[PDB]
Amino acid sequence: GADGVGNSSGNWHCDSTWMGDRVITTSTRTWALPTYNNHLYKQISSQSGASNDNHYFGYSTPWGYFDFNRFHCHFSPRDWQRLINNNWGFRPKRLNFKLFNIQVKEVTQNDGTTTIANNLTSTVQVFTDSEYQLPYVLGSAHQGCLPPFPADVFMVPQYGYLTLNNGSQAVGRSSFYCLEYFPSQMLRTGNNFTFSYTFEDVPFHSSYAHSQSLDRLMNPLIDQYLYYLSRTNTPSGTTTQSRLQFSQAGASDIRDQSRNWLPGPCYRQQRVSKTSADNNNSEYSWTGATKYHLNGRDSLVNPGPAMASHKDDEEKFFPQSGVLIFGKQGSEKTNVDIEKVMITDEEEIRTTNPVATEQYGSVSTNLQRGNRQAATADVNTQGVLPGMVWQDRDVYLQGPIWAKIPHTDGHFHPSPLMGGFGLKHPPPQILIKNTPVPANPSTTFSAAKFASFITQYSTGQVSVEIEWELQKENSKRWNPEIQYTSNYNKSVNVDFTVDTNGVYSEPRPIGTRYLTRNL
Amino acid sequence: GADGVGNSSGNWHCDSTWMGDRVITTSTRTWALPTYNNHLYKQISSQSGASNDNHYFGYSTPWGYFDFNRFHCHFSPRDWQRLINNNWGFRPKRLNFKLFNIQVKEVTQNDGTTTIANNLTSTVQVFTDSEYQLPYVLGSAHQGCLPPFPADVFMVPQYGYLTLNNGSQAVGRSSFYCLEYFPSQMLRTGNNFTFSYTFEDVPFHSSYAHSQSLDRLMNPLIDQYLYYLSRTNTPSGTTTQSRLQFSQAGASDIRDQSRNWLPGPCYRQQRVSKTSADNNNSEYSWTGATKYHLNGRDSLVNPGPAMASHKDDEEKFFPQSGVLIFGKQGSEKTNVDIEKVMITDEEEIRTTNPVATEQYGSVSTNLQRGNRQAATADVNTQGVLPGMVWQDRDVYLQGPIWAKIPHTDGHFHPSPLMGGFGLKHPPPQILIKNTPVPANPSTTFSAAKFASFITQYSTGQVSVEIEWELQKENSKRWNPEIQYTSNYNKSVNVDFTVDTNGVYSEPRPIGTRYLTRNL
Amino acid sequence: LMGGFGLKHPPPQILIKNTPVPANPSTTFSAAKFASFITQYSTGQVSVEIEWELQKENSKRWNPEIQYTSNYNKSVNVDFTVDTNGVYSEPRPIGTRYLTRNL
């Protein structure tokens, strides 16, 4: 699209409509973009000394990108609630994007006095990496997505990436991608950039919780017909004499019943409690946390494989890195106290996946014989096994929406671990930069790189609309399901509202599983 | 319809489907019908002495009728919840009824031993009073409607009615309707009786609560332009000297602001509190309760005109007869203690209708002058006034569904007072009786009325399906609405479930207003 | 895991109940749940037919495969038969793998 200077390049679309089966969440926000790295690509690396587990090598670019991989960039409390309360599941189908009403300003810091003014002509160029030839950054839970609250103006993030490294230094194989080596489209004012995408058949996120659970799944009333090993030894006057007898598992017997499927896999996490007291006093934050390691650098295992966060009656506990944790609007960056964060809870799964903090089961160790007692041992890490079945990490309104499946020789069940939809070809990276403006050059020629540009930034609005599909409920469940509600009682502030000084804020994390489906 | 003896006259339909705009609740239950008044019509009257406010005269009939004027005869907790959580409103549209698989048994109490057996031939006759020529009983909150819970078998109520009376005695004008003077259709087994109805344009029951309220309705930011009387007298050195000055109502001024509409009407009720303590000790149950009176008999004013049950912070109180009160499954018939009942609460209205227990406003009494102070007085009964606006009593799952608008020269806004839909021509009364079976007659003729019949009753199932329309939500409300949920925490029994001895039970009354619409 | 075929949508559950039969009710009305029914049960036959597909053998295996046979020698009772008092009985569990395919 194209037009004039006194012509709005696009209108403001920010609705949300439900169609019974679909529902489209349109949404627009105003943004701003500075000139990063003063227009140059800069090489960047870990700090020489820095622990090995923390080295790196890569580049930062003068390019800034766009991102809305956060559910709340599309759903509004209320809306989300609608969804989350009457749908067995849902998934994204297609999207449409558009930047417009772009405007380029140029600040002038003459002595003690700045003065911003329109640089009409100068441009901002955009380009979408629709061929995925660029290090996909999104999906890395970074923060600089869209504001949950419309009215909020925002700054565009700067693109940076990482290649290979042998400590703080580069290794040859590492590649250096240059963003100008693409065909950016250049916008001036009166210019807009639209583009549209279509998702790929993915599974509806399961937005329901299970009423039955693996173990308790058969019918009480009837005993099976298969037998199991009831007792081993037997009374012989005073002493026992080994004599194995078997029984037919019934209701009273349950624990012993024969089955057909196994809980999901696991990778044991340390348990910490919301109650300061209980927790051993010391620094096992890193030392005790569950991790894995590549090329000799141990990394953390955050968002551990999807597994319930606490047994019955222990909402007080949680994994050291088995859950998602968001900050309460305002919460500072580092070492903030428990009271400043919102920890997610995944009890809803208990029913199928193991509890993060407790071992999977316990396999037998030795082979018993008359002169040898029967061994056994608990298992803290069980990789996928036939017959296992499980549930993936719920979603949360202010959580990630999707993530790119890495291009590898092999993947195994790609639901992104941080939760979300695992996409092979996700929404392409959208980039934006401000074509430089060489400030006054010298009369006599010089072949040096230009270094003195006009100080200036850009701004303008952006809009994103997405169509989601739904799987409606359908249970013959007689008694009421659970629903997500807002507290009745009076409060000094409404949830998901602007305070007295107009600061919007999300009180709690809102999950997705409320409706109840049987297993 | 018709067929044979070994042929099911109908199948069992008991589903419930939602179509986005409609939703059909089908429902079938098994029933039983005895032979009332041993087959005769009996004249009936108050007990000679009995307080005048309690006299009456009328008849009881050998006929039993059918009734489902209770929302839970169609909605199942869950279902109801669906409705109640995502709909600005709804109303009934049409219905279809069918009796079938009728079966007539005949008990034999030979000495110390009864023995029931099939009286194949004998019949049960049904007939619907589709011309409303019979005293419409339904709508009178009687109890003998359908079981909320399907699996429950039930007994059919007996038809009785009331005419005029001058104390315990009849007055001529009083009519005596005879049920045989209709054309009953006679069913034998293999016979079924279907019939269908269509409702009449009625208003969707408002199933939402108001976010604004009459008083607080204008915009804070701006002061009006109309002036009101700020002060009357004025400082004159030591003494005041009358000097009326006026102000322009603003935010701080609010109470004084000029408006455009008035709260609904009222009829003051006594306030009682759920807290035994507070309540004055004595018997003002009748003496103090709000009532009205015709032909010299004071009757009670139950379900008073629709008006909020308590101001902010007083959920502890309520009208003496301004609310609906249901029994907790089991609760005996008389003088049962507060702990045995469930009292409905209509706070949701506060916003438009007056509070039941507190006066409407206060009008001025006298005309003031120098030598006369300004009078004023509170008003406890305000009949409809121009500009008044209000809300009708909510509904409740186990509440009435509708009621017949009395045939009179004049009605005023017919939403039935007990709540529900006010119908001009409601679902016709359906009646049923068992054609008598003269037990062995004497060889020699006698012209006396037959008095010795075969002892026998009937049974068989009945089905009712109804189509309801809906008005879906649609508010730009950002923050979450309130929804109806079931408690998370463990409990010895699930709500709306059968206990250990299979006794279904409704824990609490469930209203209808949860979703929030602005005023 | 107990072995068998894993089905996503298996043969639907089939249910059956006997519509109750309220035994003699009282002349005067009562809104209580009916509790006195006619004592009675049902009976009748049921039939199930199923079509199974097969994958026939096909090995160039020269020497004889193993097969499932019934013992030659005399016995007081035939296997999978009714005893003297007509009580059918399955002597042993019979598997499925007998024919031999290469890996």
PDB file of N, CA, C and O in Angstrom, chain B residues 470-500:
ATOM      1  N   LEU B 470     -31.809 -17.612  23.374  1.00  0.00           N
ATOM      2  CA  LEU B 470     -30.799 -16.943  24.186  1.00  0.00           C
ATOM      3  C   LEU B 470     -30.381 -15.624  23.650  1.00  0.00           C
ATOM      4  O   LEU B 470     -30.436 -15.383  22.464  1.00  0.00           O
ATOM      5  N   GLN B 471     -29.875 -14.789  24.531  1.00  0.00           N
ATOM      6  CA  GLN B 471     -29.405 -13.490  24.114  1.00  0.00           C
ATOM      7  C   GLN B 471     -27.979 -13.593  24.573  1.00  0.00           C
ATOM      8  O   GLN B 471     -27.759 -13.644  25.765  1.00  0.00           O
ATOM      9  N   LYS B 472     -27.009 -13.650  23.669  1.00  0.00           N
ATOM     10  CA  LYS B 472     -25.629 -13.771  24.122  1.00  0.00           C
ATOM     11  C   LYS B 472     -25.037 -12.468  24.626  1.00  0.00           C
ATOM     12  O   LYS B 472     -25.517 -11.393  24.320  1.00  0.00           O
ATOM     13  N   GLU B 473     -23.998 -12.586  25.446  1.00  0.00           N
ATOM     14  CA  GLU B 473     -23.288 -11.436  26.027  1.00  0.00           C
ATOM     15  C   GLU B 473     -22.683 -10.541  24.948  1.00  0.00           C
ATOM     16  O   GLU B 473     -22.780 -10.844  23.768  1.00  0.00           O
ATOM     17  N   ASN B 474     -22.038  -9.449  25.339  1.00  0.00           N
ATOM     18  CA  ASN B 474     -21.439  -8.565  24.353  1.00  0.00           C
ATOM     19  C   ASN B 474     -20.929  -7.268  24.978  1.00  0.00           C
ATOM     20  O   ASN B 474     -21.293  -6.165  24.559  1.00  0.00           O
ATOM     21  N   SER B 475     -20.068  -7.381  25.972  1.00  0.00           N
ATOM     22  CA  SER B 475     -19.621  -6.155  26.599  1.00  0.00           C
ATOM     23  C   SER B 475     -18.171  -5.983  26.376  1.00  0.00           C
ATOM     24  O   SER B 475     -17.451  -6.959  26.347  1.00  0.00           O
ATOM     25  N   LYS B 476     -17.756  -4.729  26.228  1.00  0.00           N
ATOM     26  CA  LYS B 476     -16.362  -4.391  26.058  1.00  0.00           C
ATOM     27  C   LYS B 476     -15.638  -4.340  27.426  1.00  0.00           C
ATOM     28  O   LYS B 476     -14.500  -3.870  27.553  1.00  0.00           O
ATOM     29  N   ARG B 477     -16.318  -4.850  28.445  1.00  0.00           N
ATOM     30  CA  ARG B 477     -15.757  -4.935  29.780  1.00  0.00           C
ATOM     31  C   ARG B 477     -14.370  -5.614  29.744  1.00  0.00           C
ATOM     32  O   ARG B 477     -14.227  -6.768  29.384  1.00  0.00           O
ATOM     33  N   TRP B 478     -13.326  -4.902  30.106  1.00  0.00           N
ATOM     34  CA  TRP B 478     -12.001  -5.508  30.043  1.00  0.00           C
ATOM     35  C   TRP B 478     -11.745  -6.568  31.117  1.00  0.00           C
ATOM     36  O   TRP B 478     -11.508  -7.726  30.819  1.00  0.00           O
ATOM     37  N   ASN B 479     -11.779  -6.149  32.374  1.00  0.00           N
ATOM     38  CA  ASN B 479     -11.574  -7.034  33.532  1.00  0.00           C
ATOM     39  C   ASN B 479     -12.674  -8.128  33.596  1.00  0.00           C
ATOM     40  O   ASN B 479     -13.813  -7.861  33.244  1.00  0.00           O
ATOM     41  N   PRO B 480     -12.333  -9.364  34.061  1.00  0.00           N
ATOM     42  CA  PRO B 480     -13.174 -10.559  34.224  1.00  0.00           C
ATOM     43  C   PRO B 480     -14.493 -10.338  34.901  1.00  0.00           C
ATOM     44  O   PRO B 480     -14.603  -9.548  35.817  1.00  0.00           O
ATOM     45  N   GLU B 481     -15.492 -11.066  34.424  1.00  0.00           N
ATOM     46  CA  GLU B 481     -16.829 -10.985  34.963  1.00  0.00           C
ATOM     47  C   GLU B 481     -16.826 -12.011  36.064  1.00  0.00           C
ATOM     48  O   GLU B 481     -15.843 -12.724  36.321  1.00  0.00           O
ATOM     49  N   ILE B 482     -17.934 -12.067  36.753  1.00  0.00           N
ATOM     50  CA  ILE B 482     -18.027 -13.035  37.791  1.00  0.00           C
ATOM     51  C   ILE B 482     -18.685 -14.223  37.135  1.00  0.00           C
ATOM     52  O   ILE B 482     -19.480 -14.081  36.221  1.00  0.00           O
ATOM     53  N   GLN B 483     -18.349 -15.406  37.593  1.00  0.00           N
ATOM     54  CA  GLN B 483     -18.960 -16.591  37.036  1.00  0.00           C
ATOM     55  C   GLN B 483     -19.406 -17.511  38.160  1.00  0.00           C
ATOM     56  O   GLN B 483     -18.985 -17.374  39.291  1.00  0.00           O
ATOM     57  N   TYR B 484     -20.290 -18.440  37.883  1.00  0.00           N
ATOM     58  CA  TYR B 484     -20.655 -19.339  38.956  1.00  0.00           C
ATOM     59  C   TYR B 484     -19.729 -20.571  38.864  1.00  0.00           C
ATOM     60  O   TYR B 484     -19.599 -21.177  37.805  1.00  0.00           O
ATOM     61  N   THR B 485     -19.038 -20.888  39.964  1.00  0.00           N
ATOM     62  CA  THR B 485     -18.093 -22.031  40.041  1.00  0.00           C
ATOM     63  C   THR B 485     -18.428 -22.984  41.139  1.00  0.00           C
ATOM     64  O   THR B 485     -19.236 -22.661  41.968  1.00  0.00           O
ATOM     65  N   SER B 486     -17.829 -24.162  41.164  1.00  0.00           N
ATOM     66  CA  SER B 486     -18.084 -25.071  42.279  1.00  0.00           C
ATOM     67  C   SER B 486     -16.768 -25.024  43.111  1.00  0.00           C
ATOM     68  O   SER B 486     -15.725 -24.970  42.509  1.00  0.00           O
ATOM     69  N   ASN B 487     -16.813 -24.998  44.453  1.00  0.00           N
ATOM     70  CA  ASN B 487     -15.630 -24.952  45.370  1.00  0.00           C
ATOM     71  C   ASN B 487     -14.524 -25.915  45.062  1.00  0.00           C
ATOM     72  O   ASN B 487     -14.737 -27.074  44.866  1.00  0.00           O
ATOM     73  N   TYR B 488     -13.300 -25.455  45.106  1.00  0.00           N
ATOM     74  CA  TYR B 488     -12.210 -26.347  44.747  1.00  0.00           C
ATOM     75  C   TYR B 488     -11.918 -27.434  45.768  1.00  0.00           C
ATOM     76  O   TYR B 488     -11.831 -28.632  45.447  1.00  0.00           O
ATOM     77  N   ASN B 489     -11.797 -26.968  47.003  1.00  0.00           N
ATOM     78  CA  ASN B 489     -11.464 -27.773  48.153  1.00  0.00           C
ATOM     79  C   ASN B 489     -12.248 -29.047  48.279  1.00  0.00           C
ATOM     80  O   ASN B 489     -13.412 -29.117  47.907  1.00  0.00           O
ATOM     81  N   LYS B 490     -11.583 -30.053  48.835  1.00  0.00           N
ATOM     82  CA  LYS B 490     -12.200 -31.358  49.035  1.00  0.00           C
ATOM     83  C   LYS B 490     -13.442 -31.255  49.885  1.00  0.00           C
ATOM     84  O   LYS B 490     -13.617 -30.307  50.651  1.00  0.00           O
ATOM     85  N   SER B 491     -14.332 -32.219  49.699  1.00  0.00           N
ATOM     86  CA  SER B 491     -15.584 -32.274  50.430  1.00  0.00           C
ATOM     87  C   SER B 491     -16.046 -33.721  50.520  1.00  0.00           C
ATOM     88  O   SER B 491     -15.716 -34.570  49.689  1.00  0.00           O
ATOM     89  N   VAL B 492     -16.777 -34.020  51.574  1.00  0.00           N
ATOM     90  CA  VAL B 492     -17.256 -35.372  51.744  1.00  0.00           C
ATOM     91  C   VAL B 492     -18.268 -35.759  50.688  1.00  0.00           C
ATOM     92  O   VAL B 492     -18.439 -36.931  50.390  1.00  0.00           O
ATOM     93  N   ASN B 493     -18.944 -34.767  50.122  1.00  0.00           N
ATOM     94  CA  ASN B 493     -19.927 -35.040  49.082  1.00  0.00           C
ATOM     95  C   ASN B 493     -19.921 -34.036  47.975  1.00  0.00           C
ATOM     96  O   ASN B 493     -19.765 -32.844  48.211  1.00  0.00           O
ATOM     97  N   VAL B 494     -20.100 -34.495  46.750  1.00  0.00           N
ATOM     98  CA  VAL B 494     -20.150 -33.530  45.664  1.00  0.00           C
ATOM     99  C   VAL B 494     -21.501 -32.808  45.634  1.00  0.00           C
ATOM    100  O   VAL B 494     -22.531 -33.382  45.949  1.00  0.00           O
ATOM    101  N   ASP B 495     -21.497 -31.536  45.269  1.00  0.00           N
ATOM    102  CA  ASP B 495     -22.763 -30.823  45.228  1.00  0.00           C
ATOM    103  C   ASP B 495     -23.662 -31.248  44.072  1.00  0.00           C
ATOM    104  O   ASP B 495     -23.234 -31.405  42.941  1.00  0.00           O
ATOM    105  N   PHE B 496     -24.931 -31.474  44.357  1.00  0.00           N
ATOM    106  CA  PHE B 496     -25.811 -31.890  43.269  1.00  0.00           C
ATOM    107  C   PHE B 496     -25.306 -33.249  42.895  1.00  0.00           C
ATOM    108  O   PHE B 496     -24.742 -33.447  41.805  1.00  0.00           O
ATOM    109  N   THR B 497     -25.519 -34.146  43.846  1.00  0.00           N
ATOM    110  CA  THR B 497     -25.121 -35.502  43.750  1.00  0.00           C
ATOM    111  C   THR B 497     -25.876 -36.350  44.730  1.00  0.00           C
ATOM    112  O   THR B 497     -26.577 -35.873  45.612  1.00  0.00           O
ATOM    113  N   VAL B 498     -25.742 -37.644  44.564  1.00  0.00           N
ATOM    114  CA  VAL B 498     -26.402 -38.523  45.484  1.00  0.00           C
ATOM    115  C   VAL B 498     -25.447 -38.838  46.603  1.00  0.00           C
ATOM    116  O   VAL B 498     -24.258 -39.075  46.359  1.00  0.00           O
ATOM    117  N   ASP B 499     -25.952 -38.774  47.829  1.00  0.00           N
ATOM    118  CA  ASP B 499     -25.143 -39.120  48.956  1.00  0.00           C
ATOM    119  C   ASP B 499     -24.751 -40.597  48.889  1.00  0.00           C
ATOM    120  O   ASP B 499     -24.783 -41.253  47.846  1.00  0.00           O
ATOM    121  N   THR B 500     -24.330 -41.088  50.036  1.00  0.00           N
ATOM    122  CA  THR B 500     -23.939 -42.470  50.212  1.00  0.00           C
ATOM    123  C   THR B 500     -25.168 -43.378  49.992  1.00  0.00           C
ATOM    124  O   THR B 500     -25.044 -44.452  49.454  1.00  0.00           O
TER     125      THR B 500
END
